Amino acid sequence: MWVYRLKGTLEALDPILPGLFDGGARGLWEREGEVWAFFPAPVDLPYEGVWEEVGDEDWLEAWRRDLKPALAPPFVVLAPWHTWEGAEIPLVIEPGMAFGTGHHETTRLALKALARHLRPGDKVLDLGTGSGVLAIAAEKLGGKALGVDIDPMVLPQAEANAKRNGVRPRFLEGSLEAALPFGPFDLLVANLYAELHAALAPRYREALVPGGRALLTGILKDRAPLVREAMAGAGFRPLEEAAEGEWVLLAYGR
Length: 254
Ligand SMILES: C[S@@+](CC[C@H](N)C(=O)[O-])C[C@H]1O[C@@H](n2cnc3c(N)ncnc32)[C@H](O)[C@@H]1O
Known about the structure:
By secondary structure, the protein is of the alpha/beta class. Helix content is 32%, strand content 32%. The chain is elongated, with a radius of gyration of 23 Å.
C-alpha cells in the first residue's frame, strides 16, 4: 500500500480529512507533526502531500514506536529510546533480529532465575546469547560473563547492546565446547529447547564447578520430563521450576 504524508496535526488538517476519505483513504495516523493517509495506490489530491509506498521497513519503524518497557523483576527491559522512573534494574536492548528482546516468556524466566542463582563474582556462561541480554544482566548483577552463539550475525548486536548498558561481557562464536577453555563456570544459563538440553546434560556438568548452577529454559510444559530425566541422569539436583504460559525454566545444582 501507499502512504500520503502531510505536515500538520489532525486537529489542523480536520478540514481536508473528509476529502482524503473520499479519495479512498482506508487508514489515517498522526505521526509526529504529520498526518499519514493510507491508500491502495496513489490518487490525484489537491492537498500538496507526498506519496510513498509502504514496505517492511516502515512496518518495523511503526512497530518500534509502539514498543513498551517489559518487566522481569528485578529488571526492566527498555528500548534504547525508553524512559524509566521505576527502581528496577535497566536493561537496554535494541529491538533487533537477534533473539533477546525481553518480550518472550523464556527470556523473562531466565532473568528472574539469574537474579536468584547468580552472586556477585560468579563466572557465567550464556549459551546461545543471541542479543546478549542474559550476559548483560549477569554483569549488572555483579558477575563476569561469556556469551556464545553458533550464529555469528548476533554477536555485533550483542556487543552493541552490552555497550549501551555500560558493561562488557565477553562474546564469541560457537557452542559449549568453544566456551570450555574459559571455564569451568559458577553458573550456566541456556535458553534453547527441551531436546537439546537433554543431549547436553552431560556436558553441562563438565562446564560447571562442583556446586555450580545450570538454568535451562526454552522448555515447553509437555517436554519437561526429557530434561528432568536427562538432568537427574547427569547427576544434577532439581532446585527450582518456573513457567509462564507454555514455557518453563528448570534450575539445577551440580
Ligand atoms: C532463544 S535464543 C536466546 C535468546 C536470549 N539468550 C534470551 O535468553 O532471550 C537461542 C539462541 O541460541 C543460539 N543457538 C541455537 N542452537 C545453539 C547451539 N547448539 N549452541 C549455541 N547456541 C545455539 C541461536 O543462534 C539463538 O540466538
